[PDB]
Design a protein around this nucleic acid. Structure first.
Lengths: 429, 173, 331, 99, 439
RNA sequence: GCCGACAGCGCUCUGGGGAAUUCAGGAGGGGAAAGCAGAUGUGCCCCGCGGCGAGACUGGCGCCGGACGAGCUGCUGGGGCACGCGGGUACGCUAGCCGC
């Protein structure tokens, strides 16, 4: 009567948590009935312990038959939404020194805004605490935080310098020349760069020696992101291919036939299920990146999208030309056959400011847009995971938990030889 | 294998269950000295079975002036009939830890099924008790109101005057 | 503090009943949001370092009223096969952790005995009872409660175990001697009510042994007469009262307690022609007693307290009522 | 059993209350580089470790991760507790058949 | 219906307290790298187990003069340790007070072969001069013995009963003697009927009351009953076996330490096959002591090493050596199964800890759940080749390394000509232990 | 006590001081029951293993040992029963049949 629903929660439990098929079935036989019963109750007690989660996720629903989600203005959201995050919808006007790259931390507590004419600043944006504002003179290609919000790295005109929390230059990285894109591997300590002449440089930022330099042969690179699930690294190449890399394999490890012009922008899920890119041939298409199978007939963008960035939930943020649109259901993880999103969701509008980089907050419901006149910050209710885990990533971390989390992370620096496509490969034959 | 032990202090008797007993071979080891040094580890070894205060400082002064020569009182035999189980030494005994040898012999004389390791003999209960003396402020704080040092101080003036016969022939003032 | 870890065990231990309450139609989902968040706030408050017996009783009161809320809401929605035993087991956990952290707290011990008695946990109630007596042996409240509930349960031998060990320990106040004469004579009231029991020399032994104690005084002996002065429908109550008055008039023969029981002694086996008869007999003993050379002020205060201590009775001669009012005026 | 207090019959002397009251009571498209990588080789098992009989049973019975970040606290305890729990004291050889 | 998700720092600290409240989501989309972070945690577990492998506690005071050739333990106490050197002088220690010996006597003339404690408090010693019963705990400290026996022969070892006051001694006439104390003058003699050779060691079954185990330098282990006095069985092995011991949790299983560099674990009721063969030694094997918890084993070698085994291991869990420890003749456990106790030919007797990295005392629950987490994590990842090499390597000395290499090459040749001389089912390597079995 | 040349010496150098505050660490004191070593609802009955224990017999040499036993109790050893609301027999009470 209800044991059917008991088996239903058993099915969802061993889908989400069981992590494997199941061990089929003399001393070995009883030790594996032992192990299989302990694994069964382990998944079932994780599923039962999912009810203790504090926060619910944000949403907005079309209560009428004619009010639609892309029409809702942020005066309506800032009024109808609580005052602590209505604080977080702020803007910031900086005209004089170039288009402003922005990047958060991975707890969302700090952001760098780099400015291409030189102006690089690190801040705590909620409490208005400007930790650094360094002027830096010559041009700036990219800025990014390292493992904490305590060191950051900026890709200059010629080298890549890294800096402490006070904005004091600890050291210049000379071996990386005209780095145009950067990505930090966080479970490693592995600052990975693309130079303007197509050379991956994989460093370790803890030990300080470069660990795998490999010159990609596809000319100059035009895009770069990072799979959080695999630590593999997506460089976007101007023949139209998303070329997928590693420190180990000196060949491209897998390259996909994405577009026709240079593929302008890249993003992957933090769960590593899917991928979305866009290029000059203005289509923006997504892939089931595990099966390497384009799951959806491509979308179009009204302009070549200089940015895309997808959220901790399914929302994708494509920043095209001078105004950016969010897209909700591009890849439903639970659905076998992927259907097309017929209409967007929360377009941030165009009033004469070319957006140079879009970002999401990781655990807030805000989006940080990086235009030529500075940093604008907008609120969009669906994004950000509500429930975090303060063992891994803590948005409210004191100094004790910063120091403890840093030294536990250094004790669990994965080695650069541990990077592959399926990351649960360790312990096979 | 110590079961219970008896800490006698200037505010009263208190007997502790001991569970997760001490490393009887590695007592002089430094990590065991740390676990016998801080409260958050030794208190995993000691509970508090019973506390028996003094109903009067006259009972306190007779309590010193019996326990110094090493004789138990009838109220100590009362609290041990209260706390210890009814045992002969037939088939199952009970180990109690006592800081005094003649008090141990009298207490095994009165109770035939207790068997008492004295802290003059064995360094296991000498250390397992020496550490109840270190933390017995915090170990007793939840049930004894006020400081222990003043009850000690008055009991020491009382026992010195009662042993020496002080103010019966000191009238200088 | 690892309060998030140990609290995480107690919350995740609480989770499958919340699962069953969400999947039954009993509570709703935001109610379970409030419920999980409030459970969590209490578990961190309780496993926090600086805690109080007030805090433990707050979470016991709230968890138990949660169990009653789910009980009445269960009776609304006509559910059966949902049970209360994770709530009762959980509440025993809060108490066991409570009296493990603050064991010198008789609010915690009496409240835990109250819960263990109200959930009909009798053997566990006796185990809690013995642990409470061992940490508070000079507490007549606990020795009395153990002896009385043992007597009402019906094992008078185990009652006398708790009482005779109690009279061994609590020997400052007369209180537990009074309750053991009160409960032993309650048992003799049960024995003569059902009809050793014919003699009943046990509270007389409590009396004569109680002579040699540090509390043994005349006002306390008057409290012995206040104890024995009830249940006058017995076999040997005149013998017990007569031994008390005789022994006080052999050891303290010059006290207004002895003159007060010299007044009130014929009024033991009464409750009716004997009531004015023994009342005027108490007027002969009264007029014989007020003139006696003793603590005349103390006898006067006792008899203002006693003439005031009759007034609620009905069916009395109003001349006697008024003349005792004028005797209170005269003294 | 140092639990619930037993009634006093003969042996506890105590007081004359005890001797007298007991005396009376007695008296009652996609191009995948399909090439094996060298440096992912040292993280692979070089053979089925002894008790196992098949690669499905081994690599499939390493599936759930033992740790606090991935499991609940009950199964982190019930997963990491050892088989032989040895307490301090004297472990005598056994005395009678347990079953 | 525009709801965002809102968080204040009340979910970090409820204000008015100091509990850093730590929420946690167990959905695997937030915790990547399961196998790989647990690999790196397991590698740090092996590097820290190896880093904190400090096995040597110490030394029972100033030791003997000549080498400790027999020692024993009180099965009822835990700290009564006695050991008889090669001057006849036995000493009695307390494990709490290790700076000095409790008792000391020049008991015999040549050596002390047998040594045991009785059930009350008294000890017993065998030597070529016969056998003496001593009172080590007397308030008039008697340096003189209080009983003796010489009717028998050259008694070469000795072992004592569990419950009742009875002991047996392994003589030189191929016999074992049964004495029941306080009412026996001469012991009952039980021997194999026409048996000549020296009967090297003797042991009582501690679990089953009436079974006596005995080895002989007839390379033959023999089992006696005790209820009906007659020998039960006799098997001839292939090599001389120095010592026997039974299992304190299993009433049937026994270990022999042999000159074959091996421990052999046998069943008692079926002598057709061994049950385990522990084979890590380089010289002959003096002592074998089962842990009082059953499972774990210890063997003292003729060369400079103690071998820590498991019940079901086949190869050595850990090895123990110093430069100052010469030839370990006796090695036995303490009565919790944590420490191991070593009598060698330096005239010196030592405390070592079993589980060389584990440290005793009381631990906070995060310390001990950290260590239990490392041990389960290594019971998963123990065989991946970096973890396997950094566990499995140990610095054992130069002569033992050279000689076990020579044993590897020599057994390589012997198995090579075994396969050629076969070539021009099989018989199991545990079945190539039982040479013959007499009824 | 300020100033102090030459000669000589030491420390230090995005020169040298003082304050305000922001951030990164280090050392020490004092306070805190500071106590997650195996986390199984309650009550009754039958079995199994055991503990107290009155009282009773016996073997051998002034002792030690066997082997009986009224009663009472423990047990995380496992199995079987019951647990929520009604009216009745019954209340300073809930023990007991039929239902909801």
């Amino acid at each position: 009567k209800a044991e059917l629903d008991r088996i239903r929660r058993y099915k969802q439990a061993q889908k989400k948590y069981g992590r494997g098929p199941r061990v089929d079935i003399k001393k070995l036989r009883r030790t594996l009935t032992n192990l299989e019963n302990k694994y069964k109750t382990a998944a079932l007690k994780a599923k039962e312990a999912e009810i203790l989660l504090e926060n619910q996720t944000g949403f907005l629903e079309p209560e009428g038959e004619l009010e639609r989600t892309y029409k809702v203005r942020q005066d309506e959201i800032v009024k109808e939404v609580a005052v602590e995050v209505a604080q977080k919808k702020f803007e910031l006007k900086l005209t004089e020194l170039g288009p402003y790259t922005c990047e958060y931390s991975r707890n969302g507590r700090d952001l760098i805004l780099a400015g291409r004419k030189g102006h690089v600043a690190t801040m705590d944006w909620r409490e208005g605490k400007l930790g650094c504002e360094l002027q830096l003179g010559e041009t700036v290609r990219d800025a990014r935080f390292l493992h904490n919000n305590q060191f950051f790295a900026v890709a200059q005109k010629k080298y890549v310098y890294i800096y402490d929390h006070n904005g004091v230059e600890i050291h210049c990285l000379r071996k990386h020349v005209e780095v145009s894109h950067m990505e930090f591997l966080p479970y490693h300590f592995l600052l990975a760069t693309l130079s303007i002449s197509g050379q991956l440089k994989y460093q370790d930022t803890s030990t300080g020696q470069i660990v795998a330099e490999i010159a990609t042969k596809h000319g100059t690179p035009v895009s770069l992101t990072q799979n959080p699930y695999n630590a593999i690294l997506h460089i976007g190449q101007q023949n139209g291919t998303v070329t997928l890399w590693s420190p180990n394999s000196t060949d491209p490890l897998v390259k996909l036939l994405a577009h026709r012009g240079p593929v302008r922008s890249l993003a992957v899920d933090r769960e590593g299920r899917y991928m979305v890119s866009t290029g000059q041939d203005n289509k923006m298409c997504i892939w089931d990146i595990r099966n390497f199978k384009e799951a959806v007939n491509s979308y179009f963008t009204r302009a070549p999208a200089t940015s895309v960035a997808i959220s901790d939930t399914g929302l994708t943020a494509v920043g095209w030309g001078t105004h950016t649109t969010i897209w909700k259901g591009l890849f439903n993880k639970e659905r076998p056959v992927q259907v097309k999103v017929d209409s967007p969701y929360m377009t941030w509008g165009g009033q004469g400011q070319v957006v140079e980089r879009v970002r999401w907050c990781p655990f807030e419901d805000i989006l940080g847009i990086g235009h030529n006149e500075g940093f604008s910050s907008i609120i969009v209710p669906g994004a950000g995971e509500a429930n975090y885990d303060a063992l891994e990533v803590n948005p409210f971390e004191t100094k004790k938990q910063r120091q403890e989390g840093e030294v536990k992370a250094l004790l669990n620096k994965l080695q650069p030889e541990m990077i592959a496509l399926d990351p649960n490969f360790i312990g096979n034959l | 294998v110590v079961n219970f032990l008896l800490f006698e202090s200037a505010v009263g008797f208190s007997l502790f269950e001991v569970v997760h007993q001490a490393d009887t071979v590695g007592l002089e080891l430094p990590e065991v000295k740390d676990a016998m040094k801080t409260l958050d580890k030794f208190g995993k070894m000691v509970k508090l079975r019973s506390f028996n205060p003094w109903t009067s400082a006259a009972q306190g002064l007779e309590a010193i002036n019996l326990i110094s020569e090493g004789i138990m009182p009838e109220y100590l035999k009362s609290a041990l009939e209260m706390n210890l189980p009814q045992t002969s030494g037939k088939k199952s005994k009970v180990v109690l830890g006592v800081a005094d040898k003649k008090l141990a012999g009298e207490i095994t004389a009165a109770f035939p099924g207790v068997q008492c390791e004295a802290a003059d003999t064995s360094e296991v209960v000498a250390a397992l008790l020496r550490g109840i003396r270190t933390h017995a402020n915090k170990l007793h704080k939840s049930l004894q109101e006020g400081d222990i040092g003043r009850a000690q101080l008055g009991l020491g003036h009382a026992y010195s005057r009662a042993k020496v016969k002080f103010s019966v022939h000191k009238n200088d003032n | 503090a690892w309060v998030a870890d140990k609290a995480r065990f107690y919350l995740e231990r609480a989770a499958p009943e919340l699962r069953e309450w969400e999947e039954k139609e009993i509570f709703t989902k935001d109610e379970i949001r409030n419920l999980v968040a409030k459970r969590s706030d209490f578990e961190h408050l309780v496993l926090a370092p600086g805690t109080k017996p007030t805090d433990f009783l707050n979470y016991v009161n709230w968890e138990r009223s949660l169990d009653r809320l789910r009980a009445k809401r269960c009776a609304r929605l006509n559910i059966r096969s949902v049970t209360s035993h994770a709530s009762q087991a959980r509440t025993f956990g809060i108490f066991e952790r409570a009296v493990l952290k603050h064991p010198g707290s008789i609010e915690l011990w009496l409240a835990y005995l109250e819960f263990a008695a109200q959930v009909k946990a009798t053997k566990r109630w006796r185990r809690i009872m013995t642990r409470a007596l061992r940490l508070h042996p000079m507490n007549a409240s606990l020795w009395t409660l153990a002896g009385r509930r043992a007597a009402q349960n019906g094992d008078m031998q185990r009652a006398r175990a708790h009482f005779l060990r109690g009279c061994r320990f609590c020997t400052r106040e007369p209180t537990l001697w009074l309750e053991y004469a009160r409960c032993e004579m309650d048992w003799l009231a049960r024995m003569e009510a059902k009809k050793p029991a014919l003699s009943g020399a046990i509270p007389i032994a409590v009396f004569d042994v109680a002579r040699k104690q540090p509390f043994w005084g005349p006002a306390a002996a008057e409290k012995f007469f206040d104890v024995f002065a009830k249940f006058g429908h017995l076999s040997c109550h005149e013998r017990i009262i007569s031994h008390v008055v005789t022994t006080m008039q052999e050891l303290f023969p010059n006290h207004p307690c002895t003159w007060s029981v010299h007044i009130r002694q014929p009024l033991v086996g009464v409750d009716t022609p004997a009531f004015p008869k023994a009342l005027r007999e108490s007027l002969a003993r009264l007029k014989a007693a007020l003139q006696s050379t003793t603590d005349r002020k103390a006898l006067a205060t006792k008899m203002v307290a006693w003439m005031d201590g009759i007034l609620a009775i009905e069916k009395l001669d109003a001349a006697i009522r008024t003349v005792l009012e004028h005797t209170k005026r005269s003294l | 059993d140092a639990s619930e207090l037993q009634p006093i019959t003969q042996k506890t002397s105590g007081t004359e209350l005890e001797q007298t009251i007991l005396a009376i009571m007695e008296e009652s498209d996609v191009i995948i580089n399909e090439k094996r990588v060298k440096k992912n080789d040292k993280y692979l098992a070089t053979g089925l470790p002894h008790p196992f009989e098949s690669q499905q049973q081994y690599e499939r019975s390493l599936r759930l991760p033992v740790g606090p970040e991935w499991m609940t606290k009950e199964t982190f305890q019930d997963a990491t507790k050892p088989r032989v729990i040895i307490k301090q004291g004297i472990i005598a050889p056994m005395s009678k058949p347990m079953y | 219906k525009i709801k965002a998700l809102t968080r204040s720092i009340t979910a970090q600290q409820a204000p008015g307290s100091d509990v850093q409240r730590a929420p946690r989501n167990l959905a695997p989309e937030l915790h990547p790298f399961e196998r790989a972070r647990e690999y790196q945690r397991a590698l740090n577990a092996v590097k820290l187990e190896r880093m904190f492998a400090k096995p040597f506690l110490g030394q029972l005071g100033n030791g003997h003069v000549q080498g400790v050739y027999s020692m024993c333990k009180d099965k009822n106490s835990l700290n009564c340790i006695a050991s008889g050197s090669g001057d006849g002088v036995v000493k009695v220690w307390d494990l709490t007070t290790r700076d000095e010996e409790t008792w000391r006597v020049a008991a015999h003339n040549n050596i002390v072969k047998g040594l045991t404690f009785t059930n009350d408090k008294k000890l017993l010693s065998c030597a070529t001069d016969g056998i003496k019963l001593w009172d080590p705990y007397a308030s008039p400290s008697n340096t003189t013995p209080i009983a003796t026996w010489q009717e028998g022969g050259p008694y070469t070892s000795l072992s004592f009963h569990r419950s009742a006051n009875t002991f047996a001694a392994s003589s030189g006439q191929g016999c074992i003697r049964i004495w029941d104390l306080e009412h026996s003058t001469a012991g009952q003699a039980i021997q194999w009927p026409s048996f000549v050779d020296t009967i090297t060691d003797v042991c009582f079954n501690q679990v089953e009351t009436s079974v006596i185990g005995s080895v002989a330098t007839d390379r033959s282990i023999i089992l006696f009953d005790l209820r009906t006095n007659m020998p039960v069985i006799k098997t001839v092995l292939h090599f001389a076996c120095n010592r026997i011991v039974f299992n304190p949790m299993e009433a049937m299983n026994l270990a022999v330490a042999s000159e074959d560099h091996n421990i052999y674990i046998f069943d008692a009721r079926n002598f057709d096959k061994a049950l385990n063969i522990q084979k890590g030694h380089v010289a002959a094997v003096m002592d074998v002591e089962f842990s009082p918890t059953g499972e774990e084993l210890v063997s003292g070698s003729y060369d400079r090493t103690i071998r820590l085994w498991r019940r079901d291991a086949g190869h050595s869990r850990d090895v123990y050596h110093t430069k100052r420890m010469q030839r370990v003749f006796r090695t036995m456990w303490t009565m919790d199964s944590k420490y191991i106790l070593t009598g060698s030919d330096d005239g010196n007797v030592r405390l070592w800890r079993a589980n060389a990295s584990e440290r005793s005392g009381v631990k906070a629950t995060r310390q001990r759940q950290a260590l239990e987490y490392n041990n389960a994590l290594l019971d998963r990842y123990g065989h991946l080749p970096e973890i396997r090499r950094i566990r499995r390597h140990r610095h054992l000395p130069k002569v033992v390394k050279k000689a076990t290499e020579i044993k590897r090459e020599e057994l390589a040749a012997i198995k090579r000509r075994e396969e050629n001389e076969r070539k021009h089912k099989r018989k199991s390597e545990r079945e190539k232990a039982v040479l013959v079995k007499q009824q």
